[PDB]
């Protein structure tokens, strides 16, 4: 529908958003995608302004997240002074 690349500089509190989903822990019914579930006021992602709630995380750096477990994507995001996000919306 629309793919976008977004680069975030990690802040003192991390990236300032939350995610749910994955092959091990779907967030919707029979949906394994990793979705953005919250963008925190005052965090790096909100300051950037581009990330939206329910964006699908397609890739983190050069690592695709389309059929992966939750903690895999978590490790990509949490470990990393600058992180390149490819998302779908």
């Amino acid at each position: 529908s629309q793919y976008l690349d977004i680069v975030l500089l990690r802040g003192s509190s991390g990236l300032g958003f939350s995610i749910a989903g994955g092959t091990d822990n779907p967030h919707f019914d029979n949906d394994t995608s990793i979705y953005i579930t919250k963008v925190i006021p005052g965090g790096a992602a909100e300051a950037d302004g581009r990330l939206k709630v329910y964006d699908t995380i397609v890739a983190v750096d050069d690592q695709l997240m389309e059929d992966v477990a939750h903690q895999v994507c978590v490790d990509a995001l949490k470990s990393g002074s600058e992180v390149k996000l490819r998302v779908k919306r």
Binding site: G14, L15, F17, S18, I19, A20, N25, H27, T37, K38, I40, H70, V74, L77, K78
Partner: peptide, 8 residues
């Protein structure tokens, strides 16, 4: 339950 989530 629905509350599994991770903040990053």
């Amino acid at each position: 339950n629905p509350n599994p989530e991770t903040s990053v």
